[PDB]
Amino acid sequence: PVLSKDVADIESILALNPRTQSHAALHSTLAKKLDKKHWKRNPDKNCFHCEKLENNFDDIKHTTLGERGALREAMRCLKCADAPCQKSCPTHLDIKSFITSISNKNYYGAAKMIFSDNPLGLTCGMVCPTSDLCVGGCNLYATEEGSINIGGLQQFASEVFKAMNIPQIRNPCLPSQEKMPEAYSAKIALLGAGPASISCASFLARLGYSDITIFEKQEYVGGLSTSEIPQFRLPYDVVNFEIELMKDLGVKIICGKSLSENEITLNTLKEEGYKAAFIGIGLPEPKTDDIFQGLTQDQGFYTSKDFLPLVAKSSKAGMCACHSPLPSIRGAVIVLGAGDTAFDCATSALRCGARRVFLVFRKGFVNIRAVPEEVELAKEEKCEFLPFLSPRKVIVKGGRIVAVQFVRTEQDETGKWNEDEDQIVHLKADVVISAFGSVLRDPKVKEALSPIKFNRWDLPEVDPETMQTSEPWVFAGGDIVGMANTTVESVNDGKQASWYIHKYIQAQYGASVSAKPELPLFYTPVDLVDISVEMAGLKFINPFGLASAAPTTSSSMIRRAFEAGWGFALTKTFSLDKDIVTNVSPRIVRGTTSGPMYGPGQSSFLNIELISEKTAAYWCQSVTELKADFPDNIVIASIMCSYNKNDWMELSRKAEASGADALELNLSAPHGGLACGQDPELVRNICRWVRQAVQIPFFAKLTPNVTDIVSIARAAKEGGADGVTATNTVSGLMGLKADGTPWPAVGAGKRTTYGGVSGTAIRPIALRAVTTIARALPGFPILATGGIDSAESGLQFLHSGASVLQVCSAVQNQDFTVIQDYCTGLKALLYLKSIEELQGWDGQSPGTESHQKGKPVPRIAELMGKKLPNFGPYLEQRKKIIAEEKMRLKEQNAAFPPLERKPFIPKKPIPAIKDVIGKALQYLGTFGELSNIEQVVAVIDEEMCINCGKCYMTCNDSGYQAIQFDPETHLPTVTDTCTGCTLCLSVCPIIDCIRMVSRTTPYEPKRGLPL
Amino acid sequence: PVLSKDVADIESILALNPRTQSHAALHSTLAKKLDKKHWKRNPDKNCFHCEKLENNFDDIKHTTLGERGALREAMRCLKCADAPCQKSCPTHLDIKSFITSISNKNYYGAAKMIFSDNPLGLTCGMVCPTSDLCVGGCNLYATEEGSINIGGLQQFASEVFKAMNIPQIRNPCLPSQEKMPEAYSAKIALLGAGPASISCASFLARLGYSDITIFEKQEYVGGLSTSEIPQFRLPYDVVNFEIELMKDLGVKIICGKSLSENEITLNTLKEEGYKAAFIGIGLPEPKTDDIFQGLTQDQGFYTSKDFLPLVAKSSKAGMCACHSPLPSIRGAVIVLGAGDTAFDCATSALRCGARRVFLVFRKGFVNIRAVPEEVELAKEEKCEFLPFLSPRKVIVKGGRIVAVQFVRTEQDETGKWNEDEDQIVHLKADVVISAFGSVLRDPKVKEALSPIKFNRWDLPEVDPETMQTSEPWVFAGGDIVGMANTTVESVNDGKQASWYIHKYIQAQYGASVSAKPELPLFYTPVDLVDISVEMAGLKFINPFGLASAAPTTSSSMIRRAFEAGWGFALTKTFSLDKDIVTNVSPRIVRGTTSGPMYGPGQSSFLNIELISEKTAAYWCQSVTELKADFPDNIVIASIMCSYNKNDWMELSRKAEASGADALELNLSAPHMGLACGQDPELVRNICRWVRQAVQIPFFAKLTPNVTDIVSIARAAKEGGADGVTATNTVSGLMGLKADGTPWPAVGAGKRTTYGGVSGTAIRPIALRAVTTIARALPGFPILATGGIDSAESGLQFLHSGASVLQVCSAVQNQDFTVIQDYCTGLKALLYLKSIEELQGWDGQSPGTESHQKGKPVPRIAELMGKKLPNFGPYLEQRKKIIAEEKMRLKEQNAAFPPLERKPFIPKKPIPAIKDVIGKALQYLGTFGELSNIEQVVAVIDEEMCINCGKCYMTCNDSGYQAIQFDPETHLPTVTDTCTGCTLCLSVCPIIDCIRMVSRTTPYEPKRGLP
Ligand SMILES: O=c1cc[nH]c(=O)[nH]1
Ligand code: SF4
C-alpha cells in the first residue's frame, strides 16, 4: 500500500489534530451562543442560582496551592532586597527567604523560616487578609500579572512540613536545663488559649522557661481559630498541629479554669507564686443591639457567638466529645454586620441549609470592613448585599421570626449618619444572625484584672511597645487590647510581649538581658544533621562553595560569604604581574536558553570576562587575612599561567605561602584545541610542575569543551593532581539581535567573541562530565560546578560522585544568603532518608495525589471513571454528585476520629555526605545493558487532567498517533499502540498526571515493512 | 590596610543587602500598622474617597499588556488542541496560533491571524467581555494561576501591527481586477458604519467585490465604538485604524445619509441599481420611561444616548470637526440601569466632575448583567450601588432635579417581581442618567425597510444561519437583529452575512459558489515576501525543515508536515537490515535546564533513542512516494552504517535510487571518543565512500561533542561532502531523583545511559558551531540544527552562516503548524528591514519606552526628576500631580493636530535569504579585536523601575558594590564605580529599564594593590 499515508483508523485518531488554515471559518452567532455552554469553566454571569452547599465544608480558599502551582509562583517572585512584603507583614516574616526555599524545592527550610517568626504560620497562611498586609506591599503589583500569592505559598510549605510529622525541639543553643539559671523556672501564667497566648508561650519556651501554663476557659483550645472561623477556610487539624508544636516545648494547657472573680484572678495568681501573667482572653461577648432583646434561638435569632460555635462543633472533628447536629437553618437568613464575622456567618448559614442569605449593612459598599478576599467568597455563593439599612423591628408570628423592619440610613454634608423614619424596608426572613462584632463586657472578668488600668474603650491599657499593663508583672495582647483585628497581629502581640516578660522576670531574679531583643528561631531535629564532608585531606563544614567567578571578584565578598555560611570559596583566578589582564565591557549577559523570561531564575549567563584584574599580591594577602579570620572555612587559590614551568612553580608557591588550603589550576591559557586544558599532555606536565613546587593539595579545573574529558582528568591524576574541578563554562554564542549584531557587543564596531555559558542550562553537560570521571577514575576527588542552584541539584551531583559543590550563577541570580537555603535543604533531604513512613516521597515532595487546582478530588464512586471533566454540563454533574454525597454524609452523623498526631522517628541512622557520594553511579551503564524486554506504556489519570491535548498533539506530530482525544470531553486515552517513548509525560503541564507503567500486552516494534 | 574588608563607604552602600538572620525579629503591632502605609501598592480598603478623575481619559483596563508582560503570558498559554477558548469566541479566532506567534515574538503573524477572522481585532481585544466568551472556556482556569489574558494578548499583537503602519492589500489569490467576472461589480449597499457593516463590507471586499458603499447617518464612523464606548476603554485611534484597513480594500463610506422613509429606503436602493443591502444600523433610540418625559439636560436629566456621545465628542480627538465641551456634571449623579451602558455612564460621569455616583437598579446584585470586568471598574472608582429600587418620580424644584423617589422591589414565591408602595427611598441627586438600554422605534426608519417582516420584538426577522431577511436581497446583523450583545458578535454577524450575500449576488448573475463557505484570510504586502533559498544546487521553498528525529518517526508524519507548509524534511536515520535496532522505554524526557516548569516551552529534552526501527525498504519506498506527491519539497534521507566501506556505499545507493534529493550521514556509530563523527580521519573516509557511490548531494551531520568541530567539518569537506549539518545533540544527563534513581530509568534495574540534549538550552552551542564553521570554510553550505523555535531564532542562524534551518524540539513542544508562524515571521523580519521609519526597532519589537504595567508613563514636568516611586505616599503625590495636569489639560485644550495615518512604504529593496546569510560574521573575532578603551556603564530609568533591588543585590554579591539602593524609595542609582560588567541589566525583570551607555568619566581598572 501507500506507506506514507495514514490509514482510516489513524485518520480518525488525528481528527482533532491542529492543521494549518487557508480560509476564515464560518460559524453563526446563534450556533456560537449554543456551543459556549459546553466548554464553560468559570462562573456563568447569567446564573442567579447558587449551587447546593449544605453540609459541604470543603476548602473554598482561592489561594490554596498544590506543588505544581507553588513551584510556578515561587519562581515568579523577584525575591527582593529589603522586601516591602516583609515590611508589611506584622510578624516580619522573611518572605524573600522562604519563597526562595520553595522555588528550590526546600519546603522544610521555607517552613522553618515561616515558623521562626510566626508559630501559627499555617493558620496565618490560610486566613491572613494579605491584600491589606504583605501582598499589599508586593513589588510585583507593578506588573500586569500582579502580586505574589504569599499566603498560598506560606500555606503550602507549612502543609508539607506538617505532613513530614517532625517535632519542634528545645532551642539547641540553650544549656541542658539542669544548668539553667533559677530564673527560668519562674511560674508563668497565660490566660486564654488563642493565637496571642499560644505565640507568647511558644516564644517564652524558646527562651528556656520551663514552667509555662495556659489557663483556658473552654474545653477546646485555639480560640477563635477553633470556635468560629469556619472549617471550609481553616481546617481544625491545622490548629491542632500548631498546638502540638507548642507542647513539644513543654507548655502546659489547663482547660476549665477562667480568669474571673471567684476563679482565677491576678490576686490568686500572685498568692500562688506566679511571677508573670499574660492576658490573651480575646473579646468574649457579642456586640448587641437593644432591638433584639428577648429573642431566642427557638424563634430563629442568633448572635455570632451562638451560631458560629454551633457550626464549628458539628464540623470540626476533634473539637468536642459531642457529635453536634448541624443547626437546621431553613429559609431566608438575615445576617447583620460588615466585618469578617458577618461574612463567615453568611457562608456558614448556607452550609446549614439556608435557602437565601441577606447581608445587611448600616453603611454602604465602600465601607465594608472585611477585605475583598473575604467578601468575594460570599458574593460567589450568591449572598445578596443590602446597604444603608438599620434594623428597627423584628416580627414574630407563630413562635418564629417572619420579618425584620429596617430604616434607611444616609449621610449629609457634614458626613453624619442619619436614619430616615419615613423610609422603611420590610424584609421577610426566618433566621436573624447579628454579627456586629465583639466586646469585653463581663464585670467579673474585669474585676479579676484588678488593679490594672482600663482605657476609654473599657479595655486593658498596655504600653504598645512592650505590651505591659499598668502592673509590671502583667502583660496583655491580641483582641483584648483592641488594636489587633487579625490572627497574625495577635500572634505578633504575644511575640512582642514574650521579650519584655523575659526582661521583667530576669530582672526580678537580679539578672539583665541584652539591650537588643534576641528571640530564638524555630528548631527541629533536622537542624542537628551533620553536613560536613572530608575530601583530599581537607575538612569542609558544608559541601557548598563559591566558584572562581564574579561572586569572588573581591576578597571582601568572600568574607561576607563566609559570614553568611558558605563552606568554602575560590579566589577569582589570578596570575603573575606580567600576565595582568584588562576586561572589556559589556561582558556578562543573560541567557536566551529559556526564552524571553526576565528577572529571577535566568537559565544561563554568557560571559567574555577574563581572569582577575586584581594582582597576585592582593590575592595572596587576602588569602592570609581570610584564613586568619575563618580557619574552618576552606580557601582555594585559583591560578593561571602560560605554558611555562618556571611560571607555574613561582605562582603556585606564592599562593601556597599565602596559606591557601589548596590550589585550583585554571587550564584556560592558550598554547600552540588551543587551551592547555584541551590537550592531555599539556595538562599532565602542568600538574607535574605544580606537584614538584607545592605540598598542599591542588585540583585541575577541566574544560567541558573537549572530545574526551576523562582523558584530561586521567592526565591530571597521572601528573599528580589531588582532584579535578568539573567543569568550567561551555563555549557558546548566546544570540544575535535581529539586525545581526551580537550581545555582548563591545565598542562602536559592536564586536564580540565566543564566551562561556554557565548556569542550569549547562547542568546536563556538567552532570555527565562528573559522572563519566567518577565512573572511570573511582575515588578521584571531584569538585562539581555547573548549574547547581539548590540542595536538591547539589545532591544529584553528590550522588554522581562529586564531594563538594561550587556555585556561581545561582548567586548571580540572587545573593549570598541562598547558602542558608542550601544547608537546611541538604539537612532535610538527608534526615528524610531515615523516615520509613515517607519512603513514597521524592525528597521533600509528597507523592502526588489526584487533585484539581491544588485541592484533592473527592474520592466518590459515582464521581470516578464516569468521564466527567471539570467544565460545562459535566461540571454541573460533578457538583450534583458531590452535593448528594454531602447530604448522605449528613443523614448518617458518625465518624469523628481525627487521628492523634505522633511524630515519625528515624529508623536508621541519618546518612552523612560520605554515605551518599557516588551511590547513583551503579544505575549508569552502556546501552547494551538497558533492557529492551521490559517496556512501558503511558497511562493518564483523568481526574488530574486539564484537557489541553498537549499529550495528543505531541504523540501525533512527534510520536506514534496512539492517543485518542475525545471531541466532547477533551479527555485523552492512551491506546495499545503506545511505545512508551514518554514524550507525552514530558510535555504534560500537570505533574504526575501521566505515568509510565509496565506494559502488559504483547509488544512488537513497528518496522513499517518486514526485515 | 585589611584588603578583605569593606571600607566604611562600601559598608554604607551595602546597608540594605540581604544577610542571614540569627534571631526572630521584634516589631510592635503599632509600629507595623504605621510602617505599612509607606510601602502600599494596591487600593486601601479603608479609603472611601474616589481619587478624582475629572477630564482623565487615560486607559483603565486591567488587561492591557506591554511587551514584557505579553511575552510572559503568551509563554504561559498551553496552546491547546481543539482549543475551547476558540470554541467560545464568536468569531472563532485561532487563539492557539496567534498566542503561539506572540510567544515566538512574531507579532505580525499574530495580528494577521487575528484580523483574518475578526477585522475589528484591536477593538475586540480591548472591549470583549472575555469572561463570558473565550476566557470563560480557557483550560487554564483549572490551575491556581488561572485563565489566560486572551484579550490583552490580542490587543498587544494588534497594537504592534498598528504601529508598523502596514496596509491591508487586495486578496492576492484573486485574478486581476480586469479579469474579474461581471458579478463582482454588483452595487452593494450597507446601512450604518458600525462593527457589523465594517465586518460585512471587509469580507465582501476580500471576496473581490469592487463597488461597496457604506451609508452612515452621522458625520462620524465606527458606531457605538466611537459614539458611546469611553475613550478610557477604547481609544478613538483604534477605530480609525480599523476603518482605514477596510478602506484599503476600496470600500467607500458616505456620511450624512440615513435609512429613513424620506431618504434611503429599500425601494430607492432597488431603483438606483443596488443588487444587495445589509442593514447594520443598530438600535438608535434609548429606552425611556414615562417618569422622565419633559425633563431637559439643563434640568439634569440625560439618557445614555444623550450623555455618552457628548463625552465622546469632547474626549475623542478627530471624532468630530467641532471641538465640544465636556458636560457640566456637578454634584450627585444617579445612573439607572445595570448593563454595560450604565457602568460606562457611571465612570464617564466622574470624568465630567461628579462628586458622587449612585448606580441604582431594580433587581439585586446577583441580577447585574454586565460582566464582572465592567463592574469592577465602577467599584474601584467608588461608585455606590443601590439594589432593589425602581424609580417612581423625579423631584424638580427651581427648574432642576433635586431628588428621585424610588420604591423597593422584591422577589416572591414564583420569582416574579413586585413593587412595594409603602417602602420608599428619597435619594437626593442633581443629575439623572437613564441607561435602560436601546431600541428601534423611529417609524420613518421602520417604514424605509418595507416590506421585510419584523418579529414580536419589533426587529427585522432573519434566518440565523444566513442573516437573510424575508426579502432575499436584504440581510441584517448586529444589534438591530437582537441576538448580538457585543462588538465581536456584531462582527461575526457581518462575517456570516457576507458569504450568503456573496451567494445571492453570484446566483443573480447566473453563477454558483462552493457548497462549503470559504472566506479569504487577511493579507498585507508582508505576505508577498519571497523566503526561498538555494543551497547545494537544491531549491528550498522556505528554509524551515524537520530534523531527523521523533517528528519524522513515520513518513505519514512527513506527508502531513509538507501539507502544513514545511520546506523540507529529513527521514529518521535508517540503516541496513543487519543493523536493525530495538528501542527501549522510557527514552525521551523533559529538560531540567530551566527549573520545575511543566507544559509548554520546555527548554530542552534528553533522549536515549536509537536510529529508526523501520526498515530501509519502508523508508526508500516512502521517499519515492513523498517525492512523487511533493516535488517542490526537499526530502533528505538520513542514513547510518558501521565503519564499513561496502555498507555505506550500498545504503547510500539504495537511498539515492529512491529519489532522495540529498543524503544526510549520521556519524553516531561506534567504531578520542567512541563515535565515528568524533575522529576526522573516520569522517573523511566515510564521506569519501559515499561520494564515490552516489551523485546527489550529501551532508555530514556533525556532533558537537568534540574539541574542535571545524576539524570534523573540514574532514567531511575533504571527503567530498556538499555541506554539513550542525549540530546533533549534546551529550548529557538530565538528572536524578532524590533517592539516586535516574530519569529516564529503564527496566526493573532502573538503569540509564548517557543521552543527547536537544532544544533551546543547546542553542548557544549550535550557534557557536555554525559561526565557527562558516568563518573557517566560507561558502560551505551549513544546515543549522539546535534550539531553533521561531523565525527570530532562525534568522540568527542564517545571520551566522547557515542556509537552511532544521527543527525538532520546537515541534515536540507543539505540533507541525508552527511552520506557519515561522514563515510569516521571517517574511515580516525581512520586510521590516526595508522600512526606514522602523529602523529603531529590534526586529518586530518596538523601541521600549517608559511604561508601568505596560501603560505609558505620563511625561509631565512635575513628575520627573522628582524621585516618586509608584507606592505609598509617593504614589499619592504622583496621582495628585497627574490630576492637576488633567485639569490644566482641560484648558490648554487642543484636538486639531491629528495625523493622517499614511502607511510606511519600503524605501530600499526587501532582502532575500541569500542577502542575510553570514552577515553577522563581520562582528565576530578574537578577544584581542575587542576595544578595552570604549567602556560602558549601567544607567537605570527610574520611571520604569519596580523597586525590587535585584540590580543592587547582584552588584553587591557578584559585582562591584556600585549601586545605591535608597531605603525610603527603593530606587537604585548606579554610581561612578560601575565597571560595565552588565550583570545588573541581565537580571532586571523590566526589559530595557537598565541601559549600558558609553563611559564619560575616566576609567581605571580595579587592581586591589598596586
Ligand atoms: O576560566 C574562565 C575565565 C573567565 N570566564 C569563564 O567562564 N571561565
Ligand atoms: S532590577 Fe530593575 S526593576 Fe529591580 S530595582 Fe533594579 S532597575 Fe529597578
What are the main properties of this structure?
flavoprotein, oxidoreductase, mutant, uracil, 15% strand, eight-stranded parallel beta barrel, 35 strands, 1011 residues, Fumarate Reductase Iron-sulfur Protein, Chain B, domain 2, DPD, binds iron/sulfur cluster, homodimer, 5 domains, Dihydropyrimidine Dehydrogenase, five-stranded parallel β-sheet, binds uracil, FAD/NAD(P)-binding domain, Alpha-Beta Plaits
Task: Describe the fold and architecture.
- 2 copies of one chain form a homodimer.
- An 8-stranded parallel barrel of chain A has the order 18-19-22-23-24-25-28-29, surrounded by 8 helices. The first copy, chain A, has a 5-stranded parallel β-sheet with strand order 3-2-1-4-15.
- Helices cover about 30% and strands about 15% of the residues of chain A.
- Chain A has 5 domains: about 1-25 and about 925-1010, Alpha-Beta Plaits (2-Layer Sandwich), CATH 3.30.70; about 25-180, Orthogonal Bundle (Fumarate Reductase Iron-sulfur Protein, Chain B, domain 2), CATH 1.10.1060.10; about 180-285 and about 440-530, FAD/NAD(P)-binding domain (3-Layer(bba) Sandwich), CATH 3.50.50.60; about 285-440, FAD/NAD(P)-binding domain; about 530-835, Alpha-Beta Barrel (TIM Barrel).
- Chain A has 30 helices and 35 strands.
- Chain A is globular and about 105 Å long.
- With about 1000 residues, the first copy, chain A, is of the alpha/beta class.
- The interface between A and B is large, with 293 and 288 residues.
- The complex binds uracil (URA) and iron/sulfur cluster (SF4).
- Uracil binds next to loops of chain A.
